[PDB]
mmCIF file of C-alpha atoms and ligand atoms in Angstrom:
data_model
loop_
_atom_site.group_PDB
_atom_site.id
_atom_site.type_symbol
_atom_site.label_atom_id
_atom_site.label_comp_id
_atom_site.label_asym_id
_atom_site.label_seq_id
_atom_site.Cartn_x
_atom_site.Cartn_y
_atom_site.Cartn_z
ATOM 1 C CA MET A 1 126.591 89.622 105.228
ATOM 2 C CA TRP A 2 124.279 89.080 102.245
ATOM 3 C CA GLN A 3 126.716 87.598 99.707
ATOM 4 C CA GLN A 4 126.829 84.087 101.169
ATOM 5 C CA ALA A 5 123.017 83.936 101.355
ATOM 6 C CA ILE A 6 122.796 85.076 97.743
ATOM 7 C CA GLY A 7 125.472 82.559 96.799
ATOM 8 C CA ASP A 8 123.352 79.608 97.909
ATOM 9 C CA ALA A 9 120.356 80.974 96.017
ATOM 10 C CA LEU A 10 122.593 81.407 92.970
ATOM 11 C CA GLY A 11 123.899 77.852 93.052
ATOM 12 C CA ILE A 12 120.472 76.402 93.700
ATOM 13 C CA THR A 13 118.969 78.317 90.762
ATOM 14 C CA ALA A 14 121.824 77.205 88.479
ATOM 15 C CA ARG A 15 121.151 73.537 89.245
ATOM 16 C CA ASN A 16 117.377 74.052 89.094
ATOM 17 C CA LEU A 17 117.403 75.678 85.656
ATOM 18 C CA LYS A 18 119.203 72.665 84.204
ATOM 19 C CA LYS A 19 117.010 70.130 85.984
ATOM 20 C CA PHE A 20 113.748 71.991 85.386
ATOM 21 C CA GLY A 21 114.582 72.709 81.773
ATOM 22 C CA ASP A 22 111.457 74.409 80.439
ATOM 23 C CA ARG A 23 109.134 73.572 83.353
ATOM 24 C CA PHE A 24 108.213 75.836 86.277
ATOM 25 C CA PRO A 25 108.638 75.262 90.030
ATOM 26 C CA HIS A 26 105.623 75.871 92.310
ATOM 27 C CA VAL A 27 105.923 74.394 95.823
ATOM 28 C CA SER A 28 107.512 71.316 97.377
ATOM 29 C CA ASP A 29 105.318 68.627 98.925
ATOM 30 C CA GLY A 30 107.038 66.778 101.743
ATOM 31 C CA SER A 31 110.586 66.882 100.353
ATOM 32 C CA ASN A 32 113.438 69.067 99.088
ATOM 33 C CA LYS A 33 112.243 68.889 95.509
ATOM 34 C CA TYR A 34 109.945 71.354 93.766
ATOM 35 C CA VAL A 35 106.778 70.117 92.086
ATOM 36 C CA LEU A 36 106.830 71.435 88.510
ATOM 37 C CA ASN A 37 104.089 72.542 86.118
ATOM 38 C CA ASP A 38 103.992 73.481 82.448
ATOM 39 C CA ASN A 39 103.189 77.145 83.114
ATOM 40 C CA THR A 40 99.632 76.553 84.279
ATOM 41 C CA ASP A 41 99.514 78.057 87.781
ATOM 42 C CA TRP A 42 99.456 81.558 89.273
ATOM 43 C CA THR A 43 103.106 81.360 90.378
ATOM 44 C CA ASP A 44 105.096 80.677 87.215
ATOM 45 C CA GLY A 45 106.168 84.306 87.074
ATOM 46 C CA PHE A 46 108.210 83.979 90.285
ATOM 47 C CA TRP A 47 110.492 81.491 88.543
ATOM 48 C CA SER A 48 110.998 83.967 85.687
ATOM 49 C CA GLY A 49 111.518 86.637 88.334
ATOM 50 C CA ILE A 50 114.177 84.656 90.191
ATOM 51 C CA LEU A 51 116.023 83.933 86.941
ATOM 52 C CA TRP A 52 115.951 87.635 86.036
ATOM 53 C CA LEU A 53 117.192 88.507 89.520
ATOM 54 C CA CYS A 54 120.098 86.060 89.326
ATOM 55 C CA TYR A 55 120.974 87.466 85.888
ATOM 56 C CA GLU A 56 121.125 91.033 87.215
ATOM 57 C CA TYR A 57 123.284 89.910 90.143
ATOM 58 C CA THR A 58 125.833 87.910 88.143
ATOM 59 C CA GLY A 59 125.437 88.937 84.523
ATOM 60 C CA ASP A 60 125.694 85.215 83.853
ATOM 61 C CA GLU A 61 123.858 84.528 80.582
ATOM 62 C CA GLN A 62 122.756 81.076 81.763
ATOM 63 C CA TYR A 63 120.141 82.887 83.854
ATOM 64 C CA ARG A 64 119.003 85.247 81.106
ATOM 65 C CA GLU A 65 118.710 82.404 78.616
ATOM 66 C CA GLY A 66 116.444 80.625 81.068
ATOM 67 C CA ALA A 67 114.384 83.744 81.700
ATOM 68 C CA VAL A 68 114.062 84.417 77.972
ATOM 69 C CA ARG A 69 112.639 80.947 77.406
ATOM 70 C CA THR A 70 110.044 81.555 80.124
ATOM 71 C CA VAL A 71 109.012 84.709 78.264
ATOM 72 C CA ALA A 72 108.376 82.657 75.129
ATOM 73 C CA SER A 73 106.290 80.300 77.250
ATOM 74 C CA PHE A 74 104.186 83.193 78.543
ATOM 75 C CA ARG A 75 103.621 84.432 74.978
ATOM 76 C CA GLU A 76 102.235 80.997 74.111
ATOM 77 C CA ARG A 77 100.280 80.908 77.363
ATOM 78 C CA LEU A 78 98.591 84.179 76.491
ATOM 79 C CA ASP A 79 98.066 83.136 72.867
ATOM 80 C CA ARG A 80 96.037 80.084 73.856
ATOM 81 C CA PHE A 81 94.640 81.993 76.843
ATOM 82 C CA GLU A 82 95.473 79.111 79.192
ATOM 83 C CA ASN A 83 94.554 79.520 82.867
ATOM 84 C CA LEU A 84 94.467 83.313 82.625
ATOM 85 C CA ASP A 85 90.874 84.020 83.648
ATOM 86 C CA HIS A 86 92.278 85.356 86.904
ATOM 87 C CA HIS A 87 93.710 88.437 88.614
ATOM 88 C CA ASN A 88 97.139 86.761 88.846
ATOM 89 C CA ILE A 89 97.905 88.128 85.398
ATOM 90 C CA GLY A 90 100.126 90.614 87.182
ATOM 91 C CA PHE A 91 102.021 88.013 89.219
ATOM 92 C CA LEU A 92 102.536 86.015 86.043
ATOM 93 C CA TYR A 93 103.556 88.741 83.611
ATOM 94 C CA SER A 94 105.156 91.479 85.722
ATOM 95 C CA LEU A 95 108.046 89.238 86.761
ATOM 96 C CA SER A 96 108.464 87.716 83.295
ATOM 97 C CA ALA A 97 107.493 89.872 80.290
ATOM 98 C CA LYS A 98 107.598 93.258 82.044
ATOM 99 C CA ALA A 99 110.824 92.206 83.781
ATOM 100 C CA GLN A 100 112.629 91.653 80.484
ATOM 101 C CA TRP A 101 111.624 95.143 79.357
ATOM 102 C CA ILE A 102 112.806 96.548 82.682
ATOM 103 C CA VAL A 103 115.993 94.534 82.314
ATOM 104 C CA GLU A 104 116.954 95.093 78.658
ATOM 105 C CA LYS A 105 114.135 97.072 77.024
ATOM 106 C CA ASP A 106 112.977 94.191 74.819
ATOM 107 C CA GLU A 107 110.131 95.595 72.696
ATOM 108 C CA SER A 108 108.684 92.144 72.032
ATOM 109 C CA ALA A 109 108.586 91.614 75.800
ATOM 110 C CA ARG A 110 107.050 95.036 76.377
ATOM 111 C CA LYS A 111 104.201 94.312 73.962
ATOM 112 C CA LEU A 112 103.659 90.887 75.519
ATOM 113 C CA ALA A 113 103.297 92.577 78.915
ATOM 114 C CA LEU A 114 100.999 95.250 77.518
ATOM 115 C CA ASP A 115 98.866 92.549 75.896
ATOM 116 C CA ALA A 116 98.635 90.841 79.275
ATOM 117 C CA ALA A 117 97.623 94.135 80.888
ATOM 118 C CA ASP A 118 94.752 94.357 78.375
ATOM 119 C CA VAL A 119 93.263 90.990 79.297
ATOM 120 C CA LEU A 120 93.602 91.851 82.992
ATOM 121 C CA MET A 121 92.053 95.301 82.580
ATOM 122 C CA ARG A 122 88.959 93.488 81.287
ATOM 123 C CA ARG A 123 88.727 91.657 84.624
ATOM 124 C CA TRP A 124 87.406 94.972 85.944
ATOM 125 C CA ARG A 125 83.650 94.968 86.574
ATOM 126 C CA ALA A 126 82.625 98.612 86.109
ATOM 127 C CA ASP A 127 79.701 97.894 88.449
ATOM 128 C CA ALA A 128 81.342 96.003 91.302
ATOM 129 C CA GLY A 129 84.030 98.673 91.099
ATOM 130 C CA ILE A 130 86.708 96.026 91.508
ATOM 131 C CA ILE A 131 89.021 93.702 89.574
ATOM 132 C CA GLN A 132 87.528 90.211 89.858
ATOM 133 C CA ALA A 133 90.167 88.002 91.489
ATOM 134 C CA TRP A 134 89.180 84.407 90.672
ATOM 135 C CA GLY A 135 86.560 82.717 88.515
ATOM 136 C CA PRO A 136 84.895 83.929 85.267
ATOM 137 C CA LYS A 137 82.891 87.109 84.632
ATOM 138 C CA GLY A 138 79.801 87.065 86.844
ATOM 139 C CA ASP A 139 80.613 83.699 88.429
ATOM 140 C CA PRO A 140 77.739 82.414 90.649
ATOM 141 C CA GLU A 141 79.901 83.022 93.742
ATOM 142 C CA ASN A 142 83.105 84.897 92.847
ATOM 143 C CA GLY A 143 81.798 87.495 90.405
ATOM 144 C CA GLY A 144 82.290 90.272 92.929
ATOM 145 C CA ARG A 145 85.102 89.041 95.162
ATOM 146 C CA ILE A 146 88.394 90.806 95.851
ATOM 147 C CA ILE A 147 91.429 89.181 97.437
ATOM 148 C CA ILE A 148 94.175 91.235 99.065
ATOM 149 C CA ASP A 149 96.628 89.402 96.803
ATOM 150 C CA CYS A 150 95.207 91.501 93.959
ATOM 151 C CA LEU A 151 97.197 94.548 95.092
ATOM 152 C CA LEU A 152 100.308 92.955 93.594
ATOM 153 C CA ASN A 153 98.527 92.588 90.250
ATOM 154 C CA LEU A 154 97.947 96.357 89.988
ATOM 155 C CA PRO A 155 101.548 97.299 89.114
ATOM 156 C CA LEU A 156 101.145 95.607 85.708
ATOM 157 C CA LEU A 157 98.143 97.829 85.018
ATOM 158 C CA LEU A 158 99.824 100.930 86.414
ATOM 159 C CA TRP A 159 102.873 100.231 84.268
ATOM 160 C CA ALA A 160 100.771 99.697 81.131
ATOM 161 C CA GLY A 161 99.114 103.074 81.614
ATOM 162 C CA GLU A 162 102.405 104.939 81.855
ATOM 163 C CA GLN A 163 103.582 103.106 78.741
ATOM 164 C CA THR A 164 100.336 103.708 76.828
ATOM 165 C CA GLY A 165 99.530 107.102 78.294
ATOM 166 C CA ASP A 166 96.058 105.575 78.520
ATOM 167 C CA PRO A 167 94.319 106.856 81.693
ATOM 168 C CA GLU A 168 92.069 103.770 81.852
ATOM 169 C CA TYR A 169 94.655 101.705 83.705
ATOM 170 C CA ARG A 170 95.502 104.118 86.529
ATOM 171 C CA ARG A 171 91.826 104.928 87.137
ATOM 172 C CA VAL A 172 90.915 101.258 87.548
ATOM 173 C CA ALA A 173 94.128 100.686 89.512
ATOM 174 C CA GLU A 174 93.457 103.334 92.142
ATOM 175 C CA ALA A 175 89.771 102.366 92.359
ATOM 176 C CA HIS A 176 90.664 98.781 93.269
ATOM 177 C CA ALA A 177 93.404 99.765 95.724
ATOM 178 C CA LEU A 178 91.237 102.273 97.591
ATOM 179 C CA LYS A 179 88.406 99.753 97.612
ATOM 180 C CA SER A 180 90.752 97.195 99.160
ATOM 181 C CA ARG A 181 92.023 99.655 101.748
ATOM 182 C CA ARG A 182 88.449 100.410 102.813
ATOM 183 C CA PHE A 183 87.135 96.853 102.999
ATOM 184 C CA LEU A 184 90.149 94.528 103.306
ATOM 185 C CA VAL A 185 92.014 96.357 106.074
ATOM 186 C CA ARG A 186 90.469 96.288 109.560
ATOM 187 C CA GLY A 187 90.280 98.965 112.244
ATOM 188 C CA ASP A 188 93.000 97.333 114.361
ATOM 189 C CA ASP A 189 95.377 97.299 111.357
ATOM 190 C CA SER A 190 94.916 93.596 110.637
ATOM 191 C CA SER A 191 93.316 92.460 107.394
ATOM 192 C CA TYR A 192 90.726 90.211 105.791
ATOM 193 C CA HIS A 193 91.934 87.848 103.076
ATOM 194 C CA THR A 194 89.054 88.480 100.686
ATOM 195 C CA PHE A 195 85.946 90.643 100.578
ATOM 196 C CA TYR A 196 82.661 90.085 98.756
ATOM 197 C CA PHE A 197 80.587 92.698 96.913
ATOM 198 C CA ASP A 198 77.205 92.447 95.199
ATOM 199 C CA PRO A 199 77.934 91.886 91.492
ATOM 200 C CA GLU A 200 74.827 93.864 90.497
ATOM 201 C CA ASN A 201 74.979 97.048 92.596
ATOM 202 C CA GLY A 202 78.460 96.591 94.043
ATOM 203 C CA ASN A 203 77.412 97.055 97.658
ATOM 204 C CA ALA A 204 79.779 95.646 100.276
ATOM 205 C CA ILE A 205 78.679 92.231 101.489
ATOM 206 C CA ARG A 206 81.357 90.839 103.778
ATOM 207 C CA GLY A 207 84.981 89.925 104.349
ATOM 208 C CA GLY A 208 86.220 86.373 104.689
ATOM 209 C CA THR A 209 88.551 83.638 103.536
ATOM 210 C CA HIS A 210 88.880 79.987 102.579
ATOM 211 C CA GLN A 211 92.634 80.147 103.200
ATOM 212 C CA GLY A 212 93.145 82.163 106.387
ATOM 213 C CA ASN A 213 92.208 80.425 109.654
ATOM 214 C CA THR A 214 88.805 82.146 110.013
ATOM 215 C CA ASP A 215 87.023 85.025 108.269
ATOM 216 C CA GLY A 216 88.045 87.295 111.130
ATOM 217 C CA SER A 217 91.608 86.035 111.530
ATOM 218 C CA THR A 218 94.828 87.458 110.175
ATOM 219 C CA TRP A 219 96.455 85.207 107.586
ATOM 220 C CA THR A 220 100.121 86.286 107.635
ATOM 221 C CA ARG A 221 100.720 86.075 103.893
ATOM 222 C CA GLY A 222 97.602 88.200 103.421
ATOM 223 C CA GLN A 223 98.918 90.816 105.831
ATOM 224 C CA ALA A 224 102.169 90.626 103.840
ATOM 225 C CA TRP A 225 100.455 91.155 100.458
ATOM 226 C CA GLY A 226 98.859 94.217 102.008
ATOM 227 C CA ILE A 227 102.080 95.615 103.376
ATOM 228 C CA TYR A 228 103.946 95.283 100.075
ATOM 229 C CA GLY A 229 100.867 95.760 97.914
ATOM 230 C CA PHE A 230 99.737 99.061 99.415
ATOM 231 C CA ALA A 231 103.319 100.331 99.432
ATOM 232 C CA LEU A 232 103.706 99.447 95.749
ATOM 233 C CA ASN A 233 100.438 101.157 94.867
ATOM 234 C CA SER A 234 101.476 104.189 96.919
ATOM 235 C CA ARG A 235 104.533 104.606 94.703
ATOM 236 C CA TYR A 236 102.654 104.547 91.404
ATOM 237 C CA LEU A 237 99.709 106.628 92.630
ATOM 238 C CA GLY A 238 101.599 109.033 94.869
ATOM 239 C CA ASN A 239 98.912 108.215 97.395
ATOM 240 C CA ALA A 240 99.826 109.059 100.988
ATOM 241 C CA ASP A 241 96.883 107.175 102.558
ATOM 242 C CA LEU A 242 97.910 103.932 100.862
ATOM 243 C CA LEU A 243 101.421 104.489 102.229
ATOM 244 C CA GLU A 244 100.032 105.071 105.716
ATOM 245 C CA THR A 245 97.950 101.889 105.495
ATOM 246 C CA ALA A 246 101.100 99.989 104.497
ATOM 247 C CA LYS A 247 102.883 101.328 107.574
ATOM 248 C CA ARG A 248 99.991 100.449 109.861
ATOM 249 C CA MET A 249 99.898 96.860 108.571
ATOM 250 C CA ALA A 250 103.688 96.635 108.869
ATOM 251 C CA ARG A 251 103.662 97.630 112.546
ATOM 252 C CA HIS A 252 100.810 95.186 113.252
ATOM 253 C CA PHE A 253 102.819 92.401 111.592
ATOM 254 C CA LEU A 254 106.094 93.249 113.351
ATOM 255 C CA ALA A 255 104.476 93.284 116.778
ATOM 256 C CA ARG A 256 103.493 89.664 116.249
ATOM 257 C CA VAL A 257 106.770 88.196 115.003
ATOM 258 C CA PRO A 258 107.706 85.041 117.022
ATOM 259 C CA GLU A 259 110.964 84.454 118.862
ATOM 260 C CA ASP A 260 112.914 83.064 115.891
ATOM 261 C CA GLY A 261 111.938 86.031 113.726
ATOM 262 C CA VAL A 262 109.734 84.184 111.215
ATOM 263 C CA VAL A 263 105.933 84.140 111.401
ATOM 264 C CA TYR A 264 103.399 81.364 111.849
ATOM 265 C CA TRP A 265 100.878 80.924 109.028
ATOM 266 C CA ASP A 266 98.149 82.917 110.836
ATOM 267 C CA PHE A 267 98.293 85.319 113.816
ATOM 268 C CA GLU A 268 95.190 83.882 115.519
ATOM 269 C CA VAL A 269 96.170 80.208 115.766
ATOM 270 C CA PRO A 270 98.406 78.995 118.629
ATOM 271 C CA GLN A 271 101.621 81.006 118.408
ATOM 272 C CA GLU A 272 103.872 78.101 119.351
ATOM 273 C CA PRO A 273 106.282 75.645 117.620
ATOM 274 C CA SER A 274 103.598 73.029 116.886
ATOM 275 C CA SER A 275 101.764 75.422 114.561
ATOM 276 C CA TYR A 276 102.803 75.704 110.912
ATOM 277 C CA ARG A 277 104.902 78.635 109.713
ATOM 278 C CA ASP A 278 104.913 80.724 106.561
ATOM 279 C CA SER A 279 108.419 81.865 105.678
ATOM 280 C CA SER A 280 107.013 83.390 102.478
ATOM 281 C CA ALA A 281 104.989 85.914 104.513
ATOM 282 C CA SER A 282 108.141 87.040 106.307
ATOM 283 C CA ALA A 283 109.953 87.267 102.954
ATOM 284 C CA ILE A 284 107.173 89.319 101.386
ATOM 285 C CA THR A 285 107.177 91.662 104.370
ATOM 286 C CA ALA A 286 110.952 92.182 104.208
ATOM 287 C CA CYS A 287 110.477 93.484 100.655
ATOM 288 C CA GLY A 288 107.443 95.503 101.707
ATOM 289 C CA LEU A 289 109.313 97.049 104.621
ATOM 290 C CA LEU A 290 112.075 98.152 102.253
ATOM 291 C CA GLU A 291 109.538 99.488 99.750
ATOM 292 C CA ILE A 292 107.914 101.537 102.514
ATOM 293 C CA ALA A 293 111.209 102.995 103.743
ATOM 294 C CA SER A 294 112.234 103.937 100.199
ATOM 295 C CA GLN A 295 109.193 106.253 100.097
ATOM 296 C CA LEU A 296 110.099 107.967 103.378
ATOM 297 C CA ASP A 297 112.373 110.934 104.053
ATOM 298 C CA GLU A 298 115.663 110.388 105.915
ATOM 299 C CA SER A 299 114.532 112.754 108.669
ATOM 300 C CA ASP A 300 111.775 110.247 109.387
ATOM 301 C CA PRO A 301 113.313 108.078 112.150
ATOM 302 C CA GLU A 302 110.842 105.328 111.253
ATOM 303 C CA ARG A 303 112.535 104.878 107.886
ATOM 304 C CA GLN A 304 115.628 103.308 109.449
ATOM 305 C CA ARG A 305 113.412 101.298 111.786
ATOM 306 C CA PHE A 306 111.760 99.619 108.811
ATOM 307 C CA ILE A 307 115.085 99.172 107.028
ATOM 308 C CA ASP A 308 116.448 97.445 110.128
ATOM 309 C CA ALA A 309 113.262 95.431 110.608
ATOM 310 C CA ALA A 310 113.781 94.236 107.034
ATOM 311 C CA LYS A 311 117.439 93.351 107.660
ATOM 312 C CA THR A 312 116.465 91.491 110.840
ATOM 313 C CA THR A 313 113.786 89.511 109.005
ATOM 314 C CA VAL A 314 116.106 88.468 106.186
ATOM 315 C CA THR A 315 118.800 87.454 108.659
ATOM 316 C CA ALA A 316 116.178 85.422 110.536
ATOM 317 C CA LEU A 317 115.112 83.631 107.356
ATOM 318 C CA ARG A 318 118.743 82.927 106.467
ATOM 319 C CA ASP A 319 119.724 81.529 109.882
ATOM 320 C CA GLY A 320 116.761 79.293 110.618
ATOM 321 C CA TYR A 321 115.075 78.590 107.290
ATOM 322 C CA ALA A 322 117.516 78.965 104.402
ATOM 323 C CA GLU A 323 118.841 75.936 102.536
ATOM 324 C CA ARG A 324 122.522 75.560 101.747
ATOM 325 C CA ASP A 325 123.390 74.804 98.148
ATOM 326 C CA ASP A 326 124.085 71.167 99.038
ATOM 327 C CA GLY A 327 123.640 69.995 95.456
ATOM 328 C CA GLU A 328 120.194 68.557 96.214
ATOM 329 C CA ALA A 329 117.889 71.110 97.864
ATOM 330 C CA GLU A 330 115.814 73.006 95.319
ATOM 331 C CA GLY A 331 114.320 75.774 97.458
ATOM 332 C CA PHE A 332 115.803 78.945 98.971
ATOM 333 C CA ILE A 333 113.895 78.849 102.272
ATOM 334 C CA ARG A 334 112.097 76.131 104.211
ATOM 335 C CA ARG A 335 108.759 76.163 105.990
ATOM 336 C CA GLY A 336 106.593 78.168 103.653
ATOM 337 C CA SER A 337 102.947 77.116 103.529
ATOM 338 C CA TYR A 338 100.553 77.061 100.588
ATOM 339 C CA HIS A 339 97.201 75.994 102.078
ATOM 340 C CA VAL A 340 97.489 74.941 105.739
ATOM 341 C CA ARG A 341 93.691 74.847 105.704
ATOM 342 C CA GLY A 342 93.517 71.834 103.419
ATOM 343 C CA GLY A 343 96.828 70.265 104.358
ATOM 344 C CA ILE A 344 98.311 71.317 101.039
ATOM 345 C CA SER A 345 102.079 71.897 101.271
ATOM 346 C CA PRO A 346 101.819 73.307 104.842
ATOM 347 C CA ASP A 347 105.579 73.121 105.486
ATOM 348 C CA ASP A 348 107.349 73.450 102.163
ATOM 349 C CA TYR A 349 109.149 75.541 99.608
ATOM 350 C CA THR A 350 106.970 78.127 97.871
ATOM 351 C CA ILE A 351 108.357 79.688 94.694
ATOM 352 C CA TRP A 352 106.927 83.054 95.740
ATOM 353 C CA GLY A 353 108.659 82.844 99.116
ATOM 354 C CA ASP A 354 111.911 82.194 97.270
ATOM 355 C CA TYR A 355 111.392 85.139 94.933
ATOM 356 C CA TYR A 356 110.649 87.677 97.664
ATOM 357 C CA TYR A 357 113.461 86.305 99.804
ATOM 358 C CA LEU A 358 115.817 86.809 96.852
ATOM 359 C CA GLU A 359 114.337 90.221 95.949
ATOM 360 C CA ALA A 360 114.977 91.355 99.513
ATOM 361 C CA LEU A 361 118.575 90.170 99.269
ATOM 362 C CA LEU A 362 119.269 91.898 95.938
ATOM 363 C CA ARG A 363 117.553 95.002 97.264
ATOM 364 C CA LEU A 364 119.695 94.936 100.402
ATOM 365 C CA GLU A 365 122.954 93.992 98.646
ATOM 366 C CA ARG A 366 122.649 95.767 95.278
ATOM 367 C CA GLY A 367 119.616 98.009 95.629
ATOM 368 C CA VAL A 368 117.827 96.030 92.920
ATOM 369 C CA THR A 369 114.057 96.477 93.313
ATOM 370 C CA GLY A 370 112.373 93.641 91.433
ATOM 371 C CA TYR A 371 110.032 94.194 88.509
ATOM 372 C CA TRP A 372 106.939 95.880 89.950
ATOM 373 C CA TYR A 373 107.903 99.247 88.472
ATOM 374 C CA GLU A 374 110.536 100.904 86.278
ATOM 375 C CA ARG A 375 113.755 101.102 88.278
ATOM 376 C CA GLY A 376 113.712 104.602 89.700
ATOM 377 C CA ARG A 377 110.012 105.466 89.759
HETATM 378 C C1 LIG B 401 94.271 73.749 91.899
HETATM 379 C C2 LIG B 401 95.294 74.635 92.613
HETATM 380 O O1 LIG B 401 96.508 73.894 92.819
HETATM 381 C C3 LIG B 401 96.442 73.011 93.951
HETATM 382 O O2 LIG B 401 97.577 72.130 93.918
HETATM 383 C C4 LIG B 401 97.910 71.533 95.181
HETATM 384 C C5 LIG B 401 99.432 71.507 95.324
HETATM 385 O O3 LIG B 401 99.924 72.850 95.346
HETATM 386 C C6 LIG B 401 99.846 70.780 96.604
HETATM 387 O O4 LIG B 401 101.273 70.751 96.706
HETATM 388 O O5 LIG B 401 99.344 69.434 96.584
HETATM 389 C C7 LIG B 401 97.908 69.427 96.569
HETATM 390 C C8 LIG B 401 97.435 67.973 96.630
HETATM 391 O O6 LIG B 401 97.994 67.246 95.533
HETATM 392 C C9 LIG B 401 97.376 70.102 95.302
HETATM 393 O O7 LIG B 401 95.946 70.114 95.317
HETATM 394 C C10 LIG B 401 96.384 73.821 95.249
HETATM 395 O O8 LIG B 401 95.562 73.126 96.194
HETATM 396 C C11 LIG B 401 95.790 75.207 95.005
HETATM 397 O O9 LIG B 401 95.206 75.690 96.217
HETATM 398 C C12 LIG B 401 94.706 75.125 93.926
HETATM 399 O O10 LIG B 401 94.010 76.364 93.717
HETATM 400 C C13 LIG B 401 94.855 77.528 93.714
HETATM 401 O O11 LIG B 401 94.861 78.108 95.031
HETATM 402 C C14 LIG B 401 95.420 79.431 95.111
HETATM 403 C C15 LIG B 401 95.334 79.915 96.560
HETATM 404 O O12 LIG B 401 93.963 79.940 96.967
HETATM 405 C C16 LIG B 401 94.615 80.357 94.214
HETATM 406 O O13 LIG B 401 94.836 81.765 94.401
HETATM 407 C C17 LIG B 401 96.184 82.250 94.507
HETATM 408 O O14 LIG B 401 96.506 82.252 95.908
HETATM 409 C C18 LIG B 401 97.590 82.992 96.278
HETATM 410 C C19 LIG B 401 98.280 82.693 97.604
HETATM 411 O O15 LIG B 401 98.925 83.616 98.147
HETATM 412 O O16 LIG B 401 98.180 81.531 98.065
HETATM 413 C C20 LIG B 401 98.090 84.036 95.502
HETATM 414 C C21 LIG B 401 97.455 84.418 94.165
HETATM 415 O O17 LIG B 401 97.237 85.831 94.145
HETATM 416 C C22 LIG B 401 96.112 83.700 94.027
HETATM 417 O O18 LIG B 401 95.663 83.766 92.671
HETATM 418 C C23 LIG B 401 94.907 79.884 92.789
HETATM 419 O O19 LIG B 401 94.282 80.769 91.856
HETATM 420 C C24 LIG B 401 94.319 78.481 92.641
HETATM 421 O O20 LIG B 401 94.641 77.967 91.346
#
């Protein structure tokens, strides 16, 4: 059912850890090999997250040892503040530092994650009323810009608050999430990728993207970040509207799933085989669907509908996109897309797609929920 699928991921990760050594996988680029970086992108945490996931599934120290080393790398990355002037602090540290604390209660890890939360919390522009996504403070173009991806960076702040009792975190967390819900989600339940606000007064300027097909289109990964993001924020904040928004976006997504069960990179481009896909968006949604259901009561007949939608998605990814552990392939699922608009890895492995695909599996097979919040929140 789910064991075989997890088995391939397990074997692939085992080979990868040895081959990658201390480096981090990002995306493939025209082949079955991952392009590695020295912990300098926004995705390094997904590697740490996959290693932690494999460790919890097998108990095999080879995975933990690898994950532990990535934690040391993140400590050094924070120390020399390298490529951290971004909102992705959550993506980077929730699945690495925070994960280790969620996994084994490592105090050193905990503090590393809290330290990361601090630097991120400062990304909040009291005026704009939002956590600046990309660029430096007051950038001449991105000072007041929010990307839907940012919702996944909030759990690190929400977690820090509960661990520090400091109300700062939660306040800024909810402010950004409500702000996103109001300006990133559209009236037909679709969503904008990013939204711009005046840095000075904070007024709403417009919604748009440089990644989705058009400013008014629906980039599937963006819709996915919203589905999982809003659901995650609904858990921490006990916010029913955020949960409703998650459900709305989920139904919008599901109604546009193609015949083979995996989505194209954008809902507004030609929905046919010649268009590029984004298996990572389907993977993210599977997790998001399960997160949503977990917040619903059994009497709610929609709960099982989302659980089944999730199962169907994962099975679809497995059957038509998953790689077998053939001793060479380095990715879990094929046909993810980084930047179709730009021709950058438009049909490749994406480390985030792999992580969510694996998180969905461990959630479905073991009930493991990733590292966005303390197990059992
Ligand atoms: C400079 C960054 O890396 C570039 O590398 C590209 C490489 O991945 C590809 O395989 O080959 C290309 C040609 O050699 C090579 O240029 C990418 O082009 C990348 O776009 C570029 O900037 C990064 O872009 C991402 C996405 O816009 C930024 O934001 C992240 O995006 C996403 C997402 O879902 O795609 C999630 C995160 O929340 C968000 O931060 C990165 O910040 C930026 O570095």
